[PDB]
Amino acid sequence: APTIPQGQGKVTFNGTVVDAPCSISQKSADQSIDFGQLSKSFLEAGGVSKPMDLDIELVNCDITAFKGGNGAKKGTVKLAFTGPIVNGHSDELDTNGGTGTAIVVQGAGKNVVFDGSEGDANTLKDGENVLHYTAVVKKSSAVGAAVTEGAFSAVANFNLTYQ
Amino acid sequence: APTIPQGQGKVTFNGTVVDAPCSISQKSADQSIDFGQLSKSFLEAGGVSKPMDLDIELVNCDITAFKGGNGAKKGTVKLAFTGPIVNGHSDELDTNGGTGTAIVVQGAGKNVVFDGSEGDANTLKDGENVLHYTAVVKKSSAVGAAVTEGAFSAVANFNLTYQ
Amino acid sequence: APTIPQGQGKVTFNGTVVDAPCSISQKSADQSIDFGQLSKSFLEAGGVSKPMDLDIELVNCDITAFKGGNGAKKGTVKLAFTGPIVNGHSDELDTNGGTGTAIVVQGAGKNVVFDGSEGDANTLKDGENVLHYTAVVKKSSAVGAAVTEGAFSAVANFNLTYQ
Amino acid sequence: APTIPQGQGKVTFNGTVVDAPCSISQKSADQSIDFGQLSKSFLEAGGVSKPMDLDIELVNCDITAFKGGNGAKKGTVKLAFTGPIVNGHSDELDTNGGTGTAIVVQGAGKNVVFDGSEGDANTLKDGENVLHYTAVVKKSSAVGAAVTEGAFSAVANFNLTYQ
Amino acid sequence: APTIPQGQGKVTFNGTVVDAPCSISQKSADQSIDFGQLSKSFLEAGGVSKPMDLDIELVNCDITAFKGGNGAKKGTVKLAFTGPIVNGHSDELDTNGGTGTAIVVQGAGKNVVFDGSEGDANTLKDGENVLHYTAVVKKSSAVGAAVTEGAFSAVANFNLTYQ
Amino acid sequence: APTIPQGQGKVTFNGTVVDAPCSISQKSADQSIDFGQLSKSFLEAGGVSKPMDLDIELVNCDITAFKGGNGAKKGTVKLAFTGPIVNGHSDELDTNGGTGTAIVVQGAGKNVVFDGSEGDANTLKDGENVLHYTAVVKKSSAVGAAVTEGAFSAVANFNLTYQ
Amino acid sequence: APTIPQGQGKVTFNGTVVDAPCSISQKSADQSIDFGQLSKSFLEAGGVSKPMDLDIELVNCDITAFKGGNGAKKGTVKLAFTGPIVNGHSDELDTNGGTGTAIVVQGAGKNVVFDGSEGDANTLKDGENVLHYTAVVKKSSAVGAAVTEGAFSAVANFNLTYQ
């Protein structure tokens, strides 16, 4: 007897909301970079890998009322990256592994620092926006650094503030 | 002594079968949507997030013999979504949280209702099929609704019938 | 010790085969059309966007033996499009969104219908072939239709038969 | 008084080791396949579900010294699957349930048999490897087999040997 | 048994609509410029690359009723470019990289500024229109700027308004 | 007579609280790593398994007021791992079993030591944080160490302090 | 009270390094080929599909010092493909499925063999390089081979060595 539906399914929903004037798509909120396979000799020669796109897209920004009512806050943003750093460099990410290598993220004519400090303010427009960042791998600048024929793995976190 | 296999492993299998003329891949049977991070101000301004794909793929439908022998049942389907709804709206999903926000799923020129009722019949073809649905987040239409700077979480269920 | 290959990689392969006399390249099997950004006023004035190419290339058809042994089946094909349609029009695709707009695909001196029915038979030759189709956006012919300043999204499916 | 650590935690570790020349990741050692929801009519028509990936990845194989010192054993492997089988077929897995259905796993141009016997030897390379297998569901080939509108459940085990 | 269509395929559709009097083809909405390979010495000598076409085509403008009913708004448009800029220059795009180079986009007898401000109003006609822009690479005007033998990468965004 | 509820259920709740500025999810507070099945020969050759993720996520950190009022304590943390160690190495976990193998956990450009001592201070940001750690298995560095074809099992504990 | 960052995000990094003189982009390290839908009759007639690009790009090769110090090793490479093969052919990939079909990859005036053996040495230059390979589908050369109207699926692996 008991009736059986010809197709049962379920969908769930998740998200969050902040006081920001602009929204952040999950696709950019988190992400991962793969540098594939690198030549030791190349890195040992002080070489550097090709830049990877760490671009961050901002959506539904409508910073009109925002930049108006908030006065000085005229539609700029900045990021504060945090992670293990190479001593005396800061802008050099101390990857997790048994290698003498490191990762450097760059923004415009500046470098990214992973010491939790904020970077330069970035002007943005109404509606949609995107920040452009590049990441490369090189032999660490640490003293006595040496490239080990192993795997790479590193994690960096950042906060975004609006002005 | 006792011999030891050089690699032992195990694989299990699960599934089910119904009287439907078409099969449903697990990948669509259940799923989850993440709206990432939203701007309060934007939602408070009555704004709405970008559409998310809740598409449902149907496989091995071969509705030939089906639509023939079953007469009036000429190869259409419909969904009956069920969940908490906002009063006097029904098509507005009453998310679980301390926020004045809600989720609306849309199908074609119509909206989805989560009151357990069936939607419009949808013509399908032989072999493979897919239904197209979109989901967005907005400030709830509830009286006195207000957007709280917190997290979002909601669950909706649906049945699928064949005609 | 353990030796490490100087470059490891992997390639996978996928596809399928049917009783058709001609093969179908993946590039045409599935595809997507982007109409960019449209003027509301223009659409509201009953205007229509520019035609997009939905051409379908068929390869390795060699319909010699085919059209011979299969008699009446003298090297023609037809498509059966399926999707949400505007009532009383059928040839008008009921896009998914909160807009009063729709999509119309056209073939030769005829229009495409998304009710799952087959279109006109199309003569083809030996070796290589291609069908030519155009798609445009317009204000829906639905009663009380009105263009909303939002996004567009629609999905249509079709089967191909050989005669 | 008594001091309280500001965050206490614990991590455990498990695994095993064999005389194999190559290691086996847990992720492949065990696993599970879900075929979602199937059409009875389709199965009753003698239809068959889509192939599921039962691929087995082997890591750190370095079969150099191995294939050398072990002579005839020139870097091949094979699997011996074990489970309930359909009589007179063997390569057909007798699922556990009140349905007239069964599961068939396939490897290359051959089928997998669950009678505890070993399959064909598979050449592998140094470093990393992976075997490719597919699984499908069909109406059992058993005499008088009939598809019951219920659930599916089956378990199969296998050993891996190196040559 | 189960019937198999001789060719199954799927096509999707995307786009959006705004209150603009004219439509914008996707082909211009987004795009990319490649300056190929440049001579360091040349750039170091203060040289400048050849102009690249960043032209923006507007379609279905029919600004008749528009320019009429909207009075002062007599069929002109302007762009507001946004991106990283070189200090004290603004019209000089601070590319992302370890080079002392920059990009300058020019329009008519004026230069483009990437500070989010709007440029000069541009008269347009009924039906079809196109704006003409050029882009060149030069050694940055930044203090102490120097050309590094590396790669170039930059992203700029803009909004379009109608008057 | 006696009435019977149509569904009785019960839910319990557990947890704890410390003076830490940040909270610790149970999911990270405790956890377990499985290295699956390893090759003896590989380990005997001095090989090492692939890195496993022992990442520790910290939530609701809001270290604003914290890092302020606590002066020198400017938002850093460190871990003190404790367990059986291999003599003269310390950073090598003396697993429990009849094998000549051991486990090494690594953090950034440093290794983890299980002698109860604290590791390097790790800068963290406001809101959410995560530490990245890797674990591998190798043939123990103990004198006369030899890999036995058996099972692996080890337990390590750690405390977390905030500065 | 507790402060909430206006946008939190996280990025991870992965990769590896080998003793190779040249680096390998992930995009080529792994990949997948789709042959779309094929005609049975065509394959049965001994026909063959169109060639697919399996090109492998090598980056940052700088084989100057390499080819010098390593003497005989004057800047050549070769691949060793491994997978299921058709008996007495080797260069014919025994796809996984219930079809009488197979895949053949070709390089220059030679064919690729999936028996784990190395192919011909390929001269490469300094900086950037790319190898060109084609893949096609045909009716298997196996005895009694016959094309089944089903799906295709195959996996092949290879190592890269430098001389």
Numbering used by the authors:
A (entry chain A), B (entry chain H), C (entry chain F), D (entry chain I), E (entry chain E), F (entry chain J), ...: 1 to 163
Excerpt from the publication:
In a crucial step toward being able to test the various putative roles that the pilus rod has in driving translocation and in mediating mechanical resistance to external forces, we solved the 3.8 Å resolution structure of the P pilus rod using cryoelectron microscopy (cryo-EM). It contains a continuous central hollow lumen of ∼21 Å in diameter. The subunit-subunit interactions network within the pilus rod is strikingly large, with each subunit burying 45.5% of its total surface area. From residues 1–5, the very N-terminal end of PapA makes extensive stabilizing subunit-subunit contacts. The sequence after the Nte (from residue 20) forms the pilin fold, a fold previously characterized as a C-terminally truncated Ig-fold-lacking strand G. Compared to the structure of PapA in dimers (representing a state of PapA prior to incorporation in the rod), the structure of PapA in the rod has undergone a substantial conformational change in the region between strands βB and βC, where contacts with an adjacent subunit stabilize an extended region into a three-turn α-helix, αA3.
Types 1 and P pili are archetypal CU pili produced by uropathogenic Escherichia coli (UPEC) that mediate host-pathogen interactions critical in disease and biofilm formation (Flores-Mireles et al., 2015). The rod adopts a helical quaternary structure and is thought to play essential roles: its formation may drive pilus extrusion by preventing backsliding of the nascent growing pilus within the secretion pore; the rod also has striking spring-like properties, being able to uncoil and recoil depending on the intensity of shear forces generated by urine flow. During DSE, the donor strand provided by the chaperone to complement the subunit fold is replaced by another subunit’s N-terminal extension (Nte), a 10–20 residue extension found at the N terminus of each subunit except the subunit located at the very tip.
